[model samples]
Target: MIKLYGAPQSRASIIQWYLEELSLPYEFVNVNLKEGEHRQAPYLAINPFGKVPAIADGNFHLWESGAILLYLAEKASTIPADAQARALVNQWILFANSTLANGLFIEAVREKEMPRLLQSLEKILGRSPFILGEKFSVVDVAVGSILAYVPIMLKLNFDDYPAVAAYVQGLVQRPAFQASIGA
Candidate 1:
C-alpha cells in the first residue's frame, strides 16, 4: 500500500490525478497547509522540503509531484517501455514542470509569455490527441495539468490555442481526472 500526503489545493492534487489514472491503491493523508502541518516534524520526515504530495511506499519515501508521477507511472506500466518513447515522456515532463509552468505561473512575465507558450504547445498537440502522439501517456497528465491551470487557476482565455484547448478539454473528460481534480 502507498500513503500519499497532500492537501486538495496543493501540488498533491497532481499526484492524486496520476494515481487515479494508474488505478493504483493508495491512501490520502491531508497535510493542512493553513495549520502549518507541512512544516512540522512528521511531514518534514517525509519531505525535507516540507512540500505537499509526498508518497510513502512501504519503507520507501518519495516527494516532488513530477518524480512521483514518473515513479507511479513506471510501477503501473503506464509509461512507454521503449528508450526513445520513454525519453520523450521525460522530456515533456521536464518542459511541463519547468518551462511551461514557469511561463504560465510566474506573474512577472505571464502576459508576454502565454501566447508564445501556447503556440508551441498547440503545434505539438495538433499532431495528435496528446503530447506524445495518440497514446494517453503520463506525459499528458504532466502537460495537461499545466494547461488545465490556464483557465482554472490563471483565469485566462485559451481561445487562441484551439488545439491546446481541445486537448485540455479531452483530458478533463477523463474519469480519473474528473474524480481526482474535477477539471
Candidate 2:
C-alpha cells in the first residue's frame, strides 16, 4: 500500500485529495511539524527537505508536492493518458507553482508582496478556467491548496478577482477535494 506522511491543514492535503480522487488505497502518516518530527532521521531519509507530503511506495520514496501529484496521477491513470492532456496537466502545475503559489502564499505571510502578486494572478486567471483551459486536473489540486490556505490564513480578497474566485470555488466543489479536506 502507498504511505503518505503529512499533517492535516498542510500541503499534505493536496496529496490526500489526489489519492482520494484517484481512488487509491493509501495510509496517511502524520508528522508533526510543530514538534519537529519532520526533521527526525527517518522522515529525513524519506525527504531530506524535512517537509510533509512525502510518500513511501514500497521501497521507493518521493517528495515535492507538485512532483508527488504528477506521480500519483500518472500511476493511477486517474486522468486522461493522452499526450496533450498530460502536457496541459504539467503546464498548469507549473503555472500554479509559479503564479498562484508564489503570489498568494507570499501574501499570506507578508502583504508587501500583494500588489505585484495580485497583478500576476490577475493576468493569468483572467485567461483560463483553470491554468489548463477548461478541464481541471491535478493542477487544480496542487494550486487549489494555496487558495484554500491563503483565504483562511491571510484574508486575501477573494472578491477582487471574479475569475479566481469562481475558479477556486469550482475546484473546491469537486467531491474529492471537499471530502478529503472536509469542506
Candidate 3:
C-alpha cells in the first residue's frame, strides 16, 4: 500500500486529492507541522528538505508535490500515454508549482506575476474545458490546486480570467477535491 506522510493543511492535501481521485488505498501518516514533526529525524529521512507530503510505496520514496502528482498520475493512468500530451501535462504541472505558486505566494511579485500567469492560463483553458482537453487529467489537480488558492489564499478576484475562474469552479465541485482541501 502507499504510505503518505504530511500534514493535512500542507501540500499533503494535494497528494491526497489525487489519491482519492484515483481511488487508491493508502495510509495517511499525518506529520504534525505544528509540533515540527516534519522536521524531526524520521520525516527528514523521507524528505531531506523536511517538507511535508512525502510518500513511501514499498522501498520507493518520493517527495515534492508536483513529483508526487505525476507519480500518482502514471500509476493511476490519469496521464496521457501520448508523448506530446504527456509533455503538456508535465509543463503545466511545473508551471503550477513554480510559476503559479511564486506569483501567488510572494507578495513582491504577485502584482506582476499574477496577471501574466492567470492570463496565460485563461488563454489555454479557453480552448478546452481542462488544461489539456475535454477530459480531466492529473494536470487539473496540479493547476487547479494553484487556481483554487487564488480566491482563498490570494483573495483576488479572478473575474478577469473567466475561463480560469470557471475551471476552478468545476474543480472545487469534485468530491475528491472538496474532501482533500475542505473547500
Candidate 4:
C-alpha cells in the first residue's frame, strides 16, 4: 500500500480524494502538524521542506499536491498518452495549483481576483461536464478539488456562477469524493 504522510483535513486529503478515485489502496501515515512533526528528521526525509502531503509508494517518495496528483495519474495510466491531451491535463493541473488556487486562495488578492477566476471557470465548465469534456479525468481532481475548497475554506455564494455551482454539486455527490473530502 502507498504510505500517505499527512495531517487531518489538510491538502493531503485532496491527494487522498484522488487516491480513492484512482482505486489505489494506501496507508494514511499521520504527521501531526500541530505537534510540529513535519519538521522532524523523519518527515523531513520524505519532504525536505517538511510538508503534510508527501507520499511513499515503494521507494519513490514525493510531495507537492499537483505533482503528486499528476504522478498518480501517470502511475494509474489515467493521464492521456497524446501530447496535446496530456498537455491539457497538465495545463489545468498547473492552473489549479497556481492560477486558480493562488488567485483565490491567497486572501491578499481574493477580493480583487476571485470573481474573475470563478467567472472564467463558469464559462469553461458550462462548455463541458468535466474540465476537459464528457468524461471525468484527473483534471477534475486537480481543478475540482480547489473549487470544492472554496465553499469550505471561504464563504462565496455561487449564485453568480451557476455552472460552477452545478459542477461542485456533481463532484460532491461522487462516492470517491465523499469518502475522501467528505470524510
The candidate that wins on TM-score is 4
Indicate the worst ten consecutive residues by lDDT in candidate 2: 106-115
Relative to the true structure, how large is the alpha-carbon lDDT of every model? 0.86, 0.77, 0.86, 0.88
Summarize candidate 4's per-residue lDDT along 98-174 as a digit string, tens digits: 98998888989988888999889889899999988898988998889899888888876678899999999999999
On residues 43-63, what C-alpha lDDT tens digit does candidate 1 reach at each position? 899999999788999999999
Indicate the residue-level lDDT of 59 in model 4: 92
Cα-based TM-score, every candidate: 0.94, 0.80, 0.93, 0.95
* Clashing residue pair totals per candidate (backbone < 3 A): 0, 0, 0, 0
**Candidates in descending lDDT order:** 4, 3, 1, 2
Consecutive 10-residue window with the lowest summed lDDT within model 3 = 149-158
lDDT of 3 by residue, 13-119 (tens): 88888898998999989888888887788888999999978899999999999999988888877666888867877898998889889988899998898899888
The CA lDDT at 89 in model 4 is: 81
Model 2, span 1-183: residue lDDT tens = 989998867777788888887888899899988889988898899999898788899998999888899899888775687988788778767766776567656636445655665566667788987765666667778777777666778766678767777777777788987878755
RMSD, every candidate, angstroms:
1.4, 3.1, 1.5, 1.2
lDDT of model 4 at position 19: 87
Q: What TM value does model 1 have?
A: 0.94
The CA-based lDDT of model 1 is what?
0.86
The number of clashing residue pairs in model 2 is 0
lDDT of 4: 0.88
